RNA sequence: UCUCUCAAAUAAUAACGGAGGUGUCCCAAGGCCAGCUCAGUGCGGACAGAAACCACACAUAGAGCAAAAGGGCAAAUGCUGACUUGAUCUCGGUGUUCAGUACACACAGGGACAGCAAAAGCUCGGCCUAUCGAUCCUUUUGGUUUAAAGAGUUUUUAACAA
RNA sequence: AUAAGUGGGAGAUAUUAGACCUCGGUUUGGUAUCGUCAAUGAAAUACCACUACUCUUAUUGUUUCCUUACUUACUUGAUUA
RNA sequence: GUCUAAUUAAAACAAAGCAUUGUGAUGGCCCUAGCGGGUGUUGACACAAUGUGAUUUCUGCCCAGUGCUCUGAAUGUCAAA
RNA sequence: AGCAGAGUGGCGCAGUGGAAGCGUGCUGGGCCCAUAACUCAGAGGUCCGAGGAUCGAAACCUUGCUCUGCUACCA
């Protein structure tokens, strides 16, 4: 019988996600992770996750020759 | 603990009053049970008493007081001479040991009026006797 | 339907006078332990002989005789009266009315 | 959350209560109120708290009581310094407001004689009942012998539908000894009125008008 | 359990005899008094006919009195108004059943206290004849009384009366 | 005005001057601020609650209690341990 | 193929086949009051528990009722501690 | 007897102190050749009963009826 307050949005922290070195922009973001409880490992609930963004956009090739080519991050 | 009736798992042949198996309990204390077992193996030593040291779940710890009646120290020395008398052979089974005396329930007075007058068997016999005097 | 008035003038032996009494129904009042036989009753049942005292079944008894508790306003001394068997007891009765319409 | 004089965790004695003079921080004469909670007194049911008490040492009131008086009853009250009116006053009081320096509800309290109790519920009823000044036998306005009571301190007390009772027992500028009799006497009448509850009085309080609560044994 | 009959004219009296009913119903359908006259018929009265309400004459119970049936009754026991709670308290008797006992219900009284009516009187339920239950036990109401056995007090508790 | 309700009620606060004071202060007059009252309602709320509602948080003690850590209890399995 | 030795040898029983049920062993099913043990020097192609009855062919509809079952809303009801 | 739950237009079901609402059925209009279907218009409430509370009760309270489930008791 859990029952949390409400507005769990006003319980989910803040975090920055870094992209890779040899691309261009090593910030790809900031995004909203669960607040670290000693009854939740928020760090593990950042680790297993896999994303895809097309490299063209991150590379910021304005007229994108790279537009198609989809790229995955972990 | 509970001395669960040695029943065949067949229901105990008779009246509903006798149908309890597991809630049926020793009229003899666990002190005495400790003594009687020792006494059969050690039939040459005569048991005075038993006292407790410790208890967890399955077992109760006792130290049992054993006397050598065939040792001339104990023949020797006047206070304990009377224990060498043949009247004290296995006290434990006759409850002349402290454990056994309590289970047989011999206290003066009233709370024990039946059974102090006769030891536990004896009281029954006196009561149920037609004492027929000759000169009726 | 036995209709019964909320007020009845009847004899009360403390006033030694016929005085007005407020009328109430008696009912039956909860079984209590430590009752005299109940203390004994429980020991007798004490367990593994299986339910000692015979369980009364064959109940045809459609009603019960009502007792009215009549309590004198002046001396507060209370008087018991039993009445004859009737299913439906009412007090301040909604007292049946003579000739009454059945209308239009 | 209480001022340094009173600790809110401490149930003050009736002797300790008298320290209401500290709680009149306001330069002017605050009213002392005695504030009682009722428990398992079902307020919707026939357990209806109604009473009057005459407080030995007066709430400091200017009480003008108005009588509708028939026969000897008018005379009786007249001796006891009542405003003195004889049923023909219904028609002055109601229909219109008086004139100058007087409102047609220039009465603090209302009394009507039993003979005159036919006329007032029809005529006076809309204006009086909304005020709550309406004379009931539970409000104990016999105001002749009730008049020496009323001016010299009679307060009525009635249960709210949330089942609370809120009494005025005094003014704070009243000597401590005099306050003690008024709080105890008010209480003693409340105790008389209690219809069979397990714990009819669950907490007793006395509070100053601008000023911090006291919890009372 | 009760009525009528069987049941042979006191009473008693049976069969898986005959026709039936009872576990309730009712603050009046109790209690009391006053007034009234019903079943039914005849004769008048727009709406009114065979039957509606109104009006008079006749009329032994043929009606109505909760109910089964049989008794009973006409300034009532019925019907309608009025006033009410004696359908009460207490103790004893009596009838039935037949030990003429238990029980239930009924009948007449003594001691209370009344209820009603002008009163005389009547009235311990229902005009009479059915309508309901032992001990232990549960419980309440009663006097506020006795005991809880080494003394009190107070909870609890045992009880005696109905 | 939105009184959760409701009892009683016959004013309470801020400022300034004068008198009194050692002084917070007290008395008196004026001034400013809603009001019991006026206004007019279900209760009148200056004047506060007593009971309580619905939201939230800290903290101890207590109680309901779930998970996870150790191995020396117990349990299960293998061996000239 | 079996049986009511001593009145019933069959159409009954069993039976292969067919289908259904539980269980990964600190289990399932089972005995013993208990200790301890059977299946089991067995390991799901096993063991245990059922029902129908070769081959061929067919296996419909019905979980309302009575059994059986469940990671089921499980502050229904609900004991002692 | 303990405890819990249910009863709202004919029917099925919503409703948290100010009011009577939806769907489906039902009636008529119209769409349409016609009906089916749809669209439109109207009709439809002792809120199971009674009483209390409060200015006002389906609403809250309580008692009673009715239904429903478990469970204890037992002269």
From Swiss-Prot, chain A:
Tissue: Ubiquitously expressed in stage 8 embryos. During oogenesis, expression is located basally in somatic follicular epithelium and in the oocyte at the later stages.
Knockout consequences: Flies exhibit disappearance of the follicular cells of the ovary and abnormalities of the associated germline derivatives, leading to failure of egg production.
Subcellular location field: Cytoplasm
Top-rank taxon, per record: Eukaryota
Subunit and partners: Component of the small ribosomal subunit. Mature ribosomes consist of a small (40S) and a large (60S) subunit. The 40S subunit contains about 33 different proteins and 1 molecule of RNA (18S). The 60S subunit contains about 49 different proteins and 3 molecules of RNA (28S, 5.8S and 5S).
Protein family according to the UniProt entry: Belongs to the eukaryotic ribosomal protein eS1 family.
Function: Essential for oogenesis; required for late follicle cell development.
Protein name per its UniProtKB record: Small ribosomal subunit protein eS1
Native organism: Drosophila melanogaster
Lineage of source species: Eukaryota, Metazoa, Ecdysozoa, Arthropoda, Hexapoda
Gene that specifies this protein: RpS3A
Residues of the full protein shown: 17 to 90 of 268
From Swiss-Prot, chain B:
Molecular-function GO term, any one: structural constituent of ribosome
Secretion signal, residue range per the UniProt entry: none
Record region (Disordered): 117-136
Region of the whole protein represented: 69 to 204 of 204
GO annotation, biological process: cytoplasmic translation
One term under GO cellular component: cytosolic ribosome
Biased composition annotated in UniProt, kind: Basic residues: 122-136
Calcium keyword on record: no
Gene: RpL15
Keywords, alphabetical: Ribonucleoprotein, Ribosomal protein
Protein name (database record): Large ribosomal subunit protein eL15
Highest taxon listed in the record's lineage: Eukaryota
Family classification: Belongs to the eukaryotic ribosomal protein eL15 family.
Swiss-Prot record, chain D:
UniProt-recorded Gene Ontology molecular function terms: RNA binding; structural constituent of ribosome
GO terms classed as biological process: cytoplasmic translation; negative regulation of TORC1 signaling
Claim: Ribonucleoprotein is one of the keywords in the record: yes
Cystine pairings recorded for this chain: none
Record has Ribonucleoprotein as a keyword: yes
InterPro entries for this protein: eL8/uL1-like, Ribosomal_uL1, Ribosomal_uL1-like, Ribosomal_uL1/biogenesis, Ribosomal_uL1_3-a/b-sand
Domain of life: Eukaryota
Keywords: Ribonucleoprotein, Ribosomal protein
GO CC, one annotated term: cytosolic large ribosomal subunit
Protein family per UniProt: Belongs to the universal ribosomal protein uL1 family.
Protein name as it appears in the record: Large ribosomal subunit protein uL1
Provenance organism: Drosophila melanogaster
Taxonomic lineage: Eukaryota, Metazoa, Ecdysozoa, Arthropoda, Hexapoda
């Amino acid at each position: 019988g859990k029952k949390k307050v409400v507005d769990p949005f006003s319980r989910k922290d803040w975090y920055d996600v870094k992209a890779p070195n040899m691309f261009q922009t090593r910030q790809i973001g900031k995004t909203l992770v669960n607040r670290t409880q000693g009854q939740r490992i928020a760090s593990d609930y950042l680790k297993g996750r896999v994303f895809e963004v097309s490299l063209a956009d991150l590379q910021k090739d304005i007229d994108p020759e790279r537009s198609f080519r989809k790229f995955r991050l972990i | 603990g509970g001395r669960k009736r040695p029943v065949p798992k067949g229901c105990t042949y008779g009246k509903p009053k006798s149908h309890g198996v597991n809630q049926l309990k020793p009229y003899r204390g666990l002190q005495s049970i400790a003594e009687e077992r020792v006494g059969r193996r050690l039939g040459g030593l005569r048991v005075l008493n038993s006292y407790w040291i410790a208890q967890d779940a399955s077992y109760k710890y006792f130290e049992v007081i054993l006397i050598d009646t065939h040792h001339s120290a104990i023949r020797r020395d006047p206070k304990i001479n009377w224990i060498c008398k043949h009247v004290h052979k296995h006290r434990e089974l006759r409850g002349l040991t402290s454990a056994g005396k309590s289970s047989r329930g011999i206290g003066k007075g009233y709370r024990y009026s039946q059974t102090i007058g006769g030891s536990r068997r004896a009281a029954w016999k006196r009561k149920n006797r037609e004492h027929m005097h000759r000169k009726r | 339907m036995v209709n019964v008035p909320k007020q009845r003038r009847t004899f009360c032996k403390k006033c030694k006078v016929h005085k007005l009494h407020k009328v109430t129904q008696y009912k039956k009042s909860k079984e209590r332990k430590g009752a005299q036989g109940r203390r004994r009753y429980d020991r007798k049942q004490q367990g593994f002989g299986g339910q000692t005292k015979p369980i009364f079944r064959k109940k045809a008894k459609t009603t019960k005789k009502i007792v009215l508790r009549m309590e004198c306003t002046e001396c507060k001394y209370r008087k018991q009266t039993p009445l004859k068997r009737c299913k439906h007891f009412e007090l301040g009765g909604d007292k049946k009315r003579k000739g009454q319409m059945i209308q239009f | 959350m209480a001022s340094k004089v009173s600790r809110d965790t401490l149930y003050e004695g009736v002797n300790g209560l008298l320290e209401a003079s500290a709680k009149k921080k306001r330069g002017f004469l605050e009213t002392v109120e005695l504030q009682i909670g009722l428990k398992n007194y079902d307020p919707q049911k026939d357990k209806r708290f109604s009473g009057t008490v005459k407080l030995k040492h007066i709430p400091r009131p200017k009480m003008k009581v108005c009588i509708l008086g028939d026969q000897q009853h008018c005379d009786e009250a007249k001796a006891n310094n009542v405003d003195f009116m004889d049923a023909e006053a219904l028609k002055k009081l109601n229909k219109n407001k008086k004139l100058v320096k007087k409102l047609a509800k220039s009465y603090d309290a209302f009394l009507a004689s039993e003979s005159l109790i036919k006329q007032i519920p029809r005529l006076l009823g809309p204006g009086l009942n909304k005020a709550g000044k309406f004379p009931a036998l539970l409000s104990h306005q016999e105001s002749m012998i009730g008049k020496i009571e009323e001016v010299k301190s009679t307060i009525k007390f009635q249960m709210k539908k949330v089942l609370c009772l809120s009494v005025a027992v005094g003014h704070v500028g009243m000597k401590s000894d005099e306050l003690a009799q008024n709080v105890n006497l008010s209480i003693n009448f409340l105790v008389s009125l209690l219809k069979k509850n397990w714990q009819n009085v669950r907490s007793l309080h006395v509070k100053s008008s601008m000023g911090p609560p006291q919890r009372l044994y």
